[PDB]
Amino acid sequence: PRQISDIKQFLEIARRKDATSARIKKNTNKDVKFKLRCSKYLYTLVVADAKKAEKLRQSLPPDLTVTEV
Amino acid sequence: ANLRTQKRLAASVLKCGKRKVWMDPNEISEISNANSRQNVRKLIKDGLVIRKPNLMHSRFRIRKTHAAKRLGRHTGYGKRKGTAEARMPSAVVWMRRQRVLRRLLRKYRESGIDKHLYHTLYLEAKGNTFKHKRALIEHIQRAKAEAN
Amino acid sequence: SNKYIIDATAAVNDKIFDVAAFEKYLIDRIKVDGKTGNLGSSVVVSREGSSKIAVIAHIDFSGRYLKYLTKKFLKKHSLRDWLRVVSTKKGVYELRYY
Amino acid sequence: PSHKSFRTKQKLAKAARQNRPIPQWIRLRTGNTVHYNMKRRHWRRTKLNI
RNA sequence: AAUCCGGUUAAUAUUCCGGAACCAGAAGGUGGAAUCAACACGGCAACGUAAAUGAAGUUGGAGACGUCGGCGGGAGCCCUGGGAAGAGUUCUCUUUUCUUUUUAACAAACCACACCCUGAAAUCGGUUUAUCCGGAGCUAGGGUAUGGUGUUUGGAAGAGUUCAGCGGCUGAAUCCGGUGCGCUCUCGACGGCCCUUGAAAAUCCAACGGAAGUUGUUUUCACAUCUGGUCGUACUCAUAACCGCAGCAGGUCUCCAAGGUGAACAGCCUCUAGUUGAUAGAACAAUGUAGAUAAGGGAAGUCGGCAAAAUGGAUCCGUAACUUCGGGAUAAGGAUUGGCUCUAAGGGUAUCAACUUAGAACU
């Protein structure tokens, strides 16, 4: 698995056709994990900020399959 | 009647030994009906199959006697079954001693004895002198004080 | 600083144990620094309402020890069979039947 | 052992198939003189020796 | 060449299921990099960087290597101080006794004996447990390389585990640390030993060489794309699955290895796991097999001290003839040993960690 530290990188990989699905994981420390299943790697972005979390979630392309915890 | 198959399944499902598996002796008919791992899991959920706690192996006596032995108990000639070299090797004692003397030795050099004194008090430290850290200290105190 | 509850609402409803036994047994057998009777200002038991046992401790002092002391006098009063101590929330215990 | 050759498993498979009782309708045939399998083998008692 | 975790069956799992990777091969594609100063730059250097053409030929490396001994590092285990969940105990005592407190491959970032640079060292210094090192450049100072079974994060808490409810579901917890002549494995740097010096090859990489060579050329760079046959796979591996004619007290290679006592993988006892299997019952006659003990004597027994007994650990004292000088030697002979309350030293940064010896009483 790969960790992505850049939000726009996460969007770019999500835009790429190899992206298959996305998971949003809400942890007990109010930190969210945006995980993106690609052909080769599970790309994970750890967003500790709430406001950046849902603007990213609405930033995700509508065609992509986003799934709850 | 026979519940050997049920016991082997219960041990595997509960992740313990068959010695730790307990079946309600008043539910033999329903346990015998349970023939799969789904059935055994349902029995464990219902409480008809229980993993028993481990046997008791308390270390209370062991902790108490080790607390006694650190103060100097049970350490007389009537309790020593190995040689002095076996119970505490002289190689370990001298290796610890050399490390202690050398660490303090270069500590004084970096603090401010010099190179010549450090080189003299080192071959002497290797030469079985300075039986402990205090003895090396007193030698350092008398050295360079008789000189100055 | 740290704050603990021992709920006994079922006990006081059914006359199982009373406040006097709760308070006196706690005071008598709280092992603060290995001694009893030295509660001082560090550990004070200040019950509110006739259903609670509240212990305020200014030092590390475990709810497991509260559960320890509770189970002691349930055994002394010889009805541990019908009463057990269960934790509900952080530092709060209470008494359950079968 | 667990490590087998394919040739061994074939011989073992045929040995297993030949180590079976006789069908019952064989015993009812006209002119039948066969009642029980005279070539039966047990795994402890007789070895295949392959 | 390259696979891990969790789950799953009545019986199969590194093979299935879920999730997460990896290897090799192949083609072209996308993004970037070199190039009209054809085949990149930086660093005094060790060498570094995401790339950075290299034919024939030659050469080098890896693969690829004994055994022993201590030393240091890591991992698991053991041990341990608190917290939290249940559970055992509770005449009395015990802020306790026990259990559960878990984190894989893989991915990224991070991390100091050899080497380099300045400088020139005797009043010689540096330094290991172990005496090696230095005008063939020490010490010191600053660098380079090697780099996980380390740390931080992804995987990944949603899993697994523990508990509390509800009729599959809902709540919690799954925490913060220590320690070592400990154990197993492993790694590092060394030391010893040999009239003993302790495999090959397939594969893989590199160098030297310089053939070729506005578009076009290259690109061991980052990405996506596709594929991976055949056979083995149950189970036993043994006081019942093997070989001894047998469900035979025999034999048959090897891996894992908890706590206490103790020098110890000894014996004895226990935890996990496993088993409670080996015709039974009742009686205690002779003889027997297997263990014990015996007054006084102490080898009178016997072919012969055969069997048995006696001695035995550790500490201190003491130790002959003889000798190939190495031994003899634990020679022979003496003394001492519990429990408990104490001090005395021996380490690390006022304070922490750790068994190891010397006494002193009292009993």
DSSP B14-49: HTS-GGGEEE-TT-HHHHHH--SHHHHHHHHHHTSE
Conformational region of residue B55, where left means phi above 0, alpha means psi within -120 to 50, and beta covers everything else: beta
Q: Could you list the residue range(s) of the whole structural domain that residue C84 is in? A: 1-98
- Number of structural domains (chain D) is 1
CATH number of B4-51: 1.10.1650.10
Measure Cα distances from B44 to B4, B14, B19, B76 in Å.
Answer: 16, 8, 16, 55
For residue D26, what are the domain limits?
Answer: 1-49
**DSSP H stretches of helix in chain B:** 4-14, 28-33, 37-46, 60-70, 84-87, 90-111, 115-126, 133-142
Round to the nearest angstrom and report the end-to-end CA distance of chain B. 99
Question: After which residues is chain A discontinuous, taking C to N > 2.5 Å?
Answer: none
For residue A57, the one-letter residue type is: R
8 A C-beta contact, residue C74 and residue C21: no
Name the one residue in this structure whose structure tokens are 């530092």: C91
Task: Report the distance separating Cα C63 and Cα C92, nearest Å.
Answer: 8
Query: How far, in Å, is the CA of C61 from the C1' of nucleotide E95?
Result: 8
CA-to-CA separations, C2 to C35, C42, C46, D20, in angstroms, rounded: 20, 10, 13, 78
Give me the number of domains chain C comprises: 1
- Residue B69 three-state SS: helix
Chain E nucleotides with an atom closer than 7 Å to a protein C-beta: 8-11, 19-22, 70-72, 79-92, 94-99, 105-108, 123-131, 153-158, 161-162, 164-165, 167, 173, 181, 223-226, 231-237, 241-243, 246-247, 259-264, 270-276, 313-316, 336-349, 355-359
Protein CA B78 to sugar C1' E293 (Å): 29
B4 touches strand E (CB under 7 A): no
